[model samples]
Target: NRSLIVTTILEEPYVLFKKSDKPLYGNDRFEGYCIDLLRELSTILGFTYEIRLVEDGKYGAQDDVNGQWNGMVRELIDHKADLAVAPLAITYVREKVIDFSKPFMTLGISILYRKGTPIDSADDLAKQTKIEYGAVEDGATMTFFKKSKISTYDKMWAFMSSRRQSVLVKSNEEGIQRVLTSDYAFLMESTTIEFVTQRNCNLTQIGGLIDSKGYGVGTPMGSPYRDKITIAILQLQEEGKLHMMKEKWWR
Candidate 1:
């Protein structure tokens, strides 16, 4: 169709496989809060796009570590796509490679625990010699946890150091599943932990927010689409569409 091939990952509720006959087709199957937002933005900006599945867990994985940009950013830089709408974080390291829109969502690192877990605070968990916590690799959640001042959770360090066994998942979905089925793991978030808790009954935000930040749309380093997207997002926020979408999804 000559449409923009926007690359995104299957991050559930944010972006996932719609349980249907054609699981891999890029149609309504690729729908979510971020997808809807992108749809509206495209409509406003007079662009056409089709979602292309991304294979990596996070965009920064390839771009930051390997001096490559093969995650979602690769879609743009490689000319496989014209834009991306997945929850690509805007970091100084990332901004040096791709341009981003005004943040469309506030993100943070937070903990999600299973219902009826013994932990009440990070302290309670820290005191335990048994609980396992999960964090994504090279994600904001892990960075915040690694650097933040927490009263009682250097347990994370011990777990990371010890081999006998706490667990670490490659992505939030696996972390959430591990916590839900098992009794002793908490997954940290790179963005919008509330979105996960709101959709799942077994998951709940624990303690307080760990880190606060925002997530923005991204484009190739100098794409003019950045400004256009920023304006569209601001207009949506100004007219209360942004707030309403937040409430509709999270509340």
Candidate 2:
């Protein structure tokens, strides 16, 4: 292979666009935790790669209406890309369709809301009729709540669906804006909530995690790259480079 095609998505802290008056080109145009990790991996593995964004801006999901997949998963399934490096969650559903490197990071579902929100937790929001809560449409947190068998979550889903109060948004940025300006509670991964809240003092994450999950580097099914990537990840972990990168970007 000349240069592997690495599929990614633009998400703050993980992968961010660099601001420069000069015309940025190639991978130089971006900088973030994932970008640094990719650079290190390319050096260790002795390979070159080109990074591209997911067209639909979705993490990955199978549409119920047509059963077609989209996002990085779709790209890998169609052989349009060789690897995916982003904050992609490693779920059982996704695992069955594609391969993942050992988790680079662990996180859980959490509630993000502006400071001084009356709601203290999901339970608080559920018990009240005054506040509105929501999650990203086609996102893992939404899917978790919708498919969970627990009584509390099941009832929460019911509450959200009733009158369409779920208030599903198209993207995390949109959800964050809704929280900042309205009496809306946005549920998303805790890591993202942490990153955003750190930069924006007006926002805060409420309550503990609702569900636990890991973020992994994804590749096409049965990819030869999986083992090599996994080795590189393990080496990085052992060297404490992963922890260092997290501290550098996350803090």
Candidate 3:
């Protein structure tokens, strides 16, 4: 029997260290959205796998630089992991070295703001003073937001370009915390924003979805598992397992 090694990081409310302060056990620490999704995916695919914690800080942005199999991609390249089911974004640089499945969830990015904040849309957000918005550094949300085309709206572009509205947080959890503590800031992502808003009393996802994006499972460029995983995803969707997992975690 072959066991697949799956790699993930501790990004809380998504994946995190359990409170027990003991050595982690199999599938015990993986909670929230990713956990439930993987369970259904494994069921649909008919395989058993193991999840290992990866040290995210060690790799910096190496995974994005050349689509190398270090960092998240490295695990797959080294055969240390058979699949990466985290919210790993699909990018052109990555596509050069690995294949990604069709997106299972649309990770819409948006802003978070205090109630009655003057900023209502990206356009309004750009023009505001003493207001800041943040995205997790080098993560999908920041990557999309930075490269997206909000430039057509001159006022908003000007404000964004001014660098007056931007703040960079090291991780998604940090970005969410920054917004919660400061009413002047808004963090991005529809699903995560919704997750935080429901779980944390002080934070809320405000403004409409700023940009459209999603995440897909990644495999070695032509691994046989690619098609199999896609089929599994479709089956999960058909069974309503995906919806159930989403509701289970977010609600």
Candidate 4:
């Protein structure tokens, strides 16, 4: 292989467009925790990568009708990209299509809402009638709610399904902005909620996490680089670079 083709998506803290007045082409156009992690992996594994964002701008999901996948997962499956260095979660279904490195970081879904009021938990939000609720469109959190067997989550999904247009919002950035500007409640990952609430006093993560999972580096099935990536991830954790890296990008 020449240089690894690494596919990614734009997500805060993990991957984002770099702020610049002058032109930033190639890899210089982006920077974030995942970027730094990729840099470290390249140095340790002696591999170079060219990063490109997914064309569909989605994390990934099967079409159900045709069994077609989109987003980074699709790119890897179709051999359009060699690897994925993004905030992609480890899921049972996705594993069938692609291999995953050991979890780089553990994360869980949490609620994001403006401060005040008694909307303290998912149950509370479920019972309420006034404040509208939703999750990131085609996101893991949304999939969880839709596939939930629990009665509470089942009920919440019911409310959201009928108003899909209003409830299923696109992008985490839009979800965050909605909570700030409206009486809307949004479901988000715990790590992101921590960063937002840490910086903005107006927002808070209500109650505990709804579910837990880990984000892993994704590869096409049977890639020889999987073990190398996994070993390097463990090394990063053992040396505390992962923690320090998180701190560096905690904005």
The number of the candidate with the highest TM-score is 4
lDDT per model, in order?
Answer: 0.69, 0.87, 0.66, 0.90
* Candidate 4: tens digits of C-alpha lDDT, residues 167-198: 77878889889898888999989998988898
lDDT per residue as tens, model 1, 1-251: 35776777777556766677645655676677677788889789887777887656555534335667557766666666667787777766567677889888776666788766667666666666666666766454554455556644455655643632446566777778778777655646534567777777777778776556777887888887889999999999889887777676557
lDDT score, candidate 2: 0.87
Q: Write the per-residue lDDT of candidate 3 for residues 126-222, one digit (tens) a residue.
A: 6655666655655655545545565633443344445633566666777666765774565466877777777776555666776676777878678
lDDT of 2 by residue, 68-99 (tens): 87888889999989999999889888888899
Better of 2 and 3 by TM-score: 2
Best-first order by lDDT = 4, 2, 1, 3
Candidate 4 — which residues are off by over 4 angstroms?
none
Q: What TM-score does each of the candidates earn?
A: 0.80, 0.94, 0.80, 0.95
**Model 3 C-alpha lDDT versus the unseen true structure:** 0.66
Is 1 or 4 the stronger prediction by TM-score?
4
Off by over 4 Å in 2: 161-166
In model 3, the runs with Cα more than 4 Å from the true position are: 19-24, 57-70, 77-80, 152-166
Error of 3 at 236 (Å): 0.9
1 or 2: which has the higher lDDT? Answer: 2
State which candidate, 2 or 4, has the greater TM-score.
Answer: 4
Candidate 4 colliding pairs = none
Clashes of 2: 0
Name the 10 consecutive residues with the lowest summed lDDT in model 3: 55-64
